Amino acid sequence: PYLLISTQIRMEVGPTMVGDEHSDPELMQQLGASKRRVLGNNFYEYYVNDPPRIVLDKLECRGFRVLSMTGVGQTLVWCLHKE
Amino acid sequence: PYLLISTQIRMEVGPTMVGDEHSDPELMQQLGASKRRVLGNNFYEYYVNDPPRIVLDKLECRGFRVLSMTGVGQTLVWCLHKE
Amino acid sequence: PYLLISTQIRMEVGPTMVGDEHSDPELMQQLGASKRRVLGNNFYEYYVNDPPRIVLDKLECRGFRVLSMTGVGQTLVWCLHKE
Amino acid sequence: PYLLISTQIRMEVGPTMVGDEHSDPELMQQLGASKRRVLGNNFYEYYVNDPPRIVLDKLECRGFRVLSMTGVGQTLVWCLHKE
Amino acid sequence: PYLLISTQIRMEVGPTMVGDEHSDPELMQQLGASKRRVLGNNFYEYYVNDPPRIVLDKLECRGFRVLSMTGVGQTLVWCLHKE
Ligand SMILES: [K+]
Ligand SMILES: [K+]
Ligand SMILES: [K+]
Ligand SMILES: [K+]
Ligand SMILES: [K+]
């Protein structure tokens, strides 16, 4: 299984987006993530206020490892994987 | 063999492009893809309504693995590979 | 040795720039590549009219594998390697 | 554990940002990094004036390896990992 | 040790930046690099006229391998590593 998380520049602060409407609910909880819908968007998302680095470390503890990272617009995105 | 899939940000929702007009039709069918031609294009494309994460998880079951991910414009691209 | 190939978006269609004037003439021929200059082009380029995926697949048969992929401007670039 | 460092082009000169305010102070101490808040921000950043190459080599000695690199806007970002 | 090399699009031609002013002179010489300070730059840079592909191959000979590639602005950057 894969995981996509992102953050808007600057990377040193949050919030960090950690999931879509169908993300594993137990994982989102383990990260202290909340479900919300930002106005202007027509989809729900999970987020945490922690900067990306903090979230990457937490995910390592749950078995996820970073495969790739890229930028698009002013968004930094990380693709994680787990057997 | 390789596979290129993409999506425009936001990455939490679809649609997700999963093929060119020469794509393996059996795989496109297993992904639940549909063929269409956007206005202004002289070529067809396969796409699904599921967000990128869901599509990666499905491909992982088909034997694919993400080698790389990148951004170009407002588009997110994943290059997958299967032995 | 390394290889660099590219294409402008959309990624679904060609052409695909598969080499520079110093590229292996053998390799360029197995991929059905044609050399040329693009007016203003003080240099040459090898391309094929196939979309990136087709090309990536053919290069695989020749021992080349994708190490990295990135976007720059409206251009997608793949970096392949071979023992 | 993961580490995120960055720099603005040109990549040949500094400064290089080596951490947020929750960064390991011992590690920061070791790179000879300094803390400062830049006009426009509201949070602190650790940084060195050495260019990225020197920083990557210093981090290699500490057991950190580069997992990925990417540009976003005018910023180069490197994601490093350590067992 | 790490290495950072780059080039402006188009990637088919050079020059290719191969180092900063603190770069290993001995390594710079095996590449046949030259030193120069571009106007409007408060720093020196080592370059070669060879397009990226040739430099990548020359560096493979000396024990360097590509870890990541990315684009920032009109520049393509390669991060190479050597045990
Ligand atoms: K942020
Ligand atoms: K989308
Ligand atoms: K194209
Ligand atoms: K800089
Ligand atoms: K160039």
Residue in chain C nearest B71 by alpha carbon: C71
- Please state, as a whole number, how many other Cβ atoms lie within 10 Å of the Cβ of residue E18: 25
D53's CB contacts (< 8 A; 6+ apart) are: E2, E3, E4, E20, E22, E23
Torsion of CA E5, E9, E10, E13, to 10 degrees: -30
SS3 E30: helix
Strand partners, B3: B80
Ranges of H-type helices in A14-79? 25-30, 52-61
In the numeric block, the tokens 């930046």 are attached to E17
Residues contacting residue C31 through CB under 8 Å, at least 6 positions apart: C18, C48, C55, C58, C59
Query: What are the CA-CA distances from residue B14 to residues A72, A76, B47, C4 (Å)?
Result: 16, 19, 9, 30
Give the residue among C10, C25, C3, C7 at the shortest CA–CA distance from C79: C3
Determine the 3-state secondary structure of D61 from DSSP.
Answer: helix
For the record, the structure tokens of C17 come out as 């720039």
Closest CA of chain E from D47, distance in Å = 19
Which tokens hold the place of D11? 């990549």
Residue B69 neighbours by CB distance under 10 Å: 28
Closest Cα to residue C5, out of E79, A77, B79?
B79
Resolution (Å units) = 2.6
Q: d(Cα E13, Cα B19) in Å, to the nearest integer? A: 31
E58/E60 Cα distance (integer angstroms): 5
Side-chain half-sphere of A38: how many Cα atoms within 13 Å? 9
D chain contacts of residue A59, beta-carbon cutoff 8 Å = none
Which residue is listed with tokens 């590639």?
E69
d(CA E18, CA D80): 22
Q: Which of D61, D33, D63, D38 is nearest to D48 (CA)?
A: D33
Contact assessment for residue D65 and residue D80, using Cβ atoms and an 8 Å cutoff: yes
Other C-beta atoms closer than 10 Å to the C-beta of C82 total 12
The three-class DSSP label of residue C48 is strand
* Positions of E strands within C1-83: 2-8, 16-19, 34-36, 45-48, 65-72, 75-81
Question: Per the structure, how many domains does chain C have?
Answer: 1
Domain of D76 in residue numbering reads as 1-83
Burial (CB < 10 A; 0-12, 13-18, 19+), residue D47, is buried
Burial tier of E83 (Cβ tally within 10 Å: 0-12, 13-18, 19+): exposed
| Residue ranges near ligand 2 (ion) with Cβ within 5 Å | B 7-8
CB-based contact A71 D81, cutoff 8 Å: no
Q: Which residues contact B40 (CB under 8 A, 6 or more apart)?
A: none
Residue B66 to residue A81, Cβ atoms within 8 A:
yes
Q: What tokens were used for C26?
A: 């053998």
- State both tokens at B75: 């588009």
In angstroms, the Cα distances linking B42 to C32, C48, C54, C76, D70 are 23, 18, 18, 20, 32
Q: Across the beta sheet with D2-8, what order do the strands follow?
A: D34-36, D45-48, D16-19, D2-8, D75-81, D65-72
Name residues whose C-beta falls within 8 Å of residue A26's C-beta, 6 or more positions apart in sequence.
none
CA of residue E19 to ligand 4 center, whole Å: 14
Q: Measure the CA–CA gap between C6 and C8, rounded to whole angstroms.
A: 7
E11: its two tokens: 């990637």
Residue A11 CA to ligand 5 centre (angstroms): 30
- The single-letter DSSP state of residue D34 is E
Residue E76 CA to residue C70 CA, distance in Å, equals: 9
Rounded to the nearest angstrom, the gap between the alpha carbon of residue A46 and the centroid of all alpha carbons in its chain is 7
Residues contacting residue A61 through CB under 8 Å, at least 6 positions apart:
none
Distance CA B39, CA B36 (A): 10
Please check whether residue A14 is in contact with residue D78, taking contact to mean a CB–CB distance below 8 angstroms.
Answer: no
SS3 content of chain E, % helix, strand, coil (to 5): 20, 40, 40
CATH number at residue E77: 3.30.1410.10
Give yes or no for a contact between C81 and E66, defined as CB atoms under 8 angstroms apart: yes
Per the DSSP assignment, residues forming a β-bridge with C17 are: C6, C47
Between chain C and chain E, the number of residue pairs with CB atoms below 8 A apart is: 61
Of C51, C74, C75, the CB nearest to B20: C51
